[PDB]
Amino acid sequence: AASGSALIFDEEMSRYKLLWTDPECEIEVPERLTVSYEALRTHGLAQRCKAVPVRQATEQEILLAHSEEYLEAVKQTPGMNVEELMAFSKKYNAVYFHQNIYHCAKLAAGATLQLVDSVMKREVRNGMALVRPPGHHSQRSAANGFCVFNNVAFAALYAKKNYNLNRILIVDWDVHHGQGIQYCFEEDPSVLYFSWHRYEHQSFWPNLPESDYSSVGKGKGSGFNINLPWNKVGMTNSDYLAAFFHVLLPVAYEFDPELVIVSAGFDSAIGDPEGEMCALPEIFAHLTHLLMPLAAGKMCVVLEGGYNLTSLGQSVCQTVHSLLGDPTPRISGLGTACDSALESIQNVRNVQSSYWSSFKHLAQSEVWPEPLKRMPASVRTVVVPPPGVELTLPKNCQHSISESTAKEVQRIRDKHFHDLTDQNILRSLGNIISVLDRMMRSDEVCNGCVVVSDLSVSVQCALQHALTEPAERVLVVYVGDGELPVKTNDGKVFLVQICTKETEDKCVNRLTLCLREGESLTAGFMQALLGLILPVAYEFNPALVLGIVEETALMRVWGHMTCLIQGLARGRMLTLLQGYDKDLLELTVSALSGASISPLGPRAPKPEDVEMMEKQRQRLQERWGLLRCTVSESW
Ligand SMILES: O=C(NO)c1ccc(Cn2ccc3ccccc32)cc1
Ligand SMILES: [K+]
Ligand SMILES: [K+]
Ligand SMILES: [Zn+2]
């Protein structure tokens, strides 16, 4: 029953600043914070967020990750003049101190804990803290790289201590390596740390051997540390999405964290003077989106870096938009990760293969343009159960006709289905059309679910009506066996079929997954979802998703499926379920509407299934480059 998104912020954290000439520190300015709140205010997103107030972290809380000695040294800095502050700063690397910075660091820390309490008490579903100074570089007894105290380290330890959590995921998508966080949880298997970061074969700051893919943790923590070094600059949306689909999410869903914490630095975004990567802000709408099915949505985004004041606010707004569940922007031009990225992706996968049952088969050889507006839909979701059925609906849904819509069904009938008169089927067809009309052209409805009786006529009308809408491209996800009125010959339709009997597949616009039924089914299905289905879908960039389920269908995966596949097509998905099922219709509507998803926790899948999936990657990765997670073989 949790709802809303906290936005923790306070203008006091912008009242410390660099007080002497130092060109390497110039970039880290108070204006980073004011630009960010103001952007969220301009776009109406700050107003939609519960503004939880900042507090100071207590001394007892700071000692969870820091040392009496180093805390007492920093506690002395508010009494210092500028000479003394320069001297204290020079005992550390890439960090300046200010009379007010111990004050703000305590606030940046306290703000993060405020976010943790709000999320874990169900007062909000998720949140984001706009803090200065950053956290992820600082260590138990030192400040480093603009950080004083490790705000995200605090959050996990705090959430460990006061909520008795066993599994916490920390995703550090900042462009620098959060070495403070890795040090803190090195031997700890209850806090899984994933970081990607600019490395350039250790030439990039902080220049640490520990930053490479080979550091997997120590002792009982081996496997619970994951570094993905970028060894070239200019990494693109396709490189970030490849890292999620083929490293982070496979490990994240098997881990099944009880809470997700993001070190969200946006120096990894296009335009940043320190990161020099090429991902558009829109990418962060999806990095957020892809993780929200974890831990029932309990996500704590915590600002780290970001230095181009323009690129900064755009990426913050994309993250909060997604936190509030607004529709995700379509990403165009996705394709293969570059060669350096595939090398890094392939190296970390191989070294981690001893630890995760998603890479296990790898071990035994058998300046840029503006984002476009994302206002949420009038009504998010439209439901059309059988006539007579009426269950209760979330606050943002609605039941289903028109005269125009009725002339089409008659028009469609006489042309293509002359020998059909079932006034029930012909109702479904009217519903499909009218619900698609409200999705494809009105910004009013987002997605919908229609229960249907005859599948073949329902799908045909759904599909053909969408193509003339115009929908340049339609992705079709079908769970069932048998033929289906689909023409996957031109580039306008891609079909994903999940069936029980295998099928030699000729066409390359198709992905047929035959999963040997059993206890294996759920674990393997979701390897294929993150490993194959999402990467193809993302490259395809559909205008509309059409989900279909035949009546002889198991169910425990459809919510994750529905939640994730809404990253395509600005969330415009129509779902045709054949036959009434209270539970499935309830689950489909719940996921479509933005609700949180029940986690899965636990198995590992059958080799006949993982081999079936790698035959599919082999058969498709040359058409669909985003499927690649190795370097191409050169002639
Ligand atoms: O945004 C960040 N991290 O998340 C981050 C960005 C840039 C730096 C580099 N840098 C800053 C001052 C200085 C002095 C000497 C050597 C290097 C230095 C460090 C950290
Ligand atoms: K990072
Ligand atoms: K760890
Ligand atoms: Zn950074």
Curated annotation (Swiss-Prot):
Residues annotated to bind Zn(2+): D174, H176, D267
Keywords: Cytoplasm, Hydrolase, Metal-binding, Nucleus, Zinc
InterPro entries from the UniProt entry: HDAC_PDAC, His_deacetylse, His_deacetylse_dom, His_deacetylse_dom_sf, Ureohydrolase_dom_sf
Annotated substrate binding sites: D22, A94, Y307
GO molecular function: acetylputrescine deacetylase activity; acetylspermidine deacetylase activity; deacetylase activity; zinc ion binding
Keyword S-adenosyl-L-methionine: no
Pfam family of the protein (one): Hist_deacetyl
Tagged with keyword Nucleus: yes
UniProt site (Substrate specificity): E274
GO cellular component, one term: cytoplasm
Result after altering N93A: No effect on steady-state kinetic parameters
Name recorded for this polypeptide: Polyamine deacetylase HDAC10
Annotated GO biological process: epigenetic regulation of gene expression; homologous recombination; macroautophagy; polyamine deacetylation; spermidine deacetylation; swimming behavior
Active-site residue list: H137
Assigned EC number: 3.5.1.48, 3.5.1.62
Family named by the database record: Belongs to the histone deacetylase family. HD type 2 subfamily.
Catalytic reaction annotation: N(8)-acetylspermidine + H2O = spermidine + acetate; N-acetylputrescine + H2O = putrescine + acetate; N-acetylcadaverine + H2O = cadaverine + acetate
Outcome recorded upon mutating E274L: Affects substrate specificity, diminishing N(8)-acetyl-spermidine deacetylase activity by 20-fold and enhancing acetyl-lysine deacetylase activity by about 100-fold
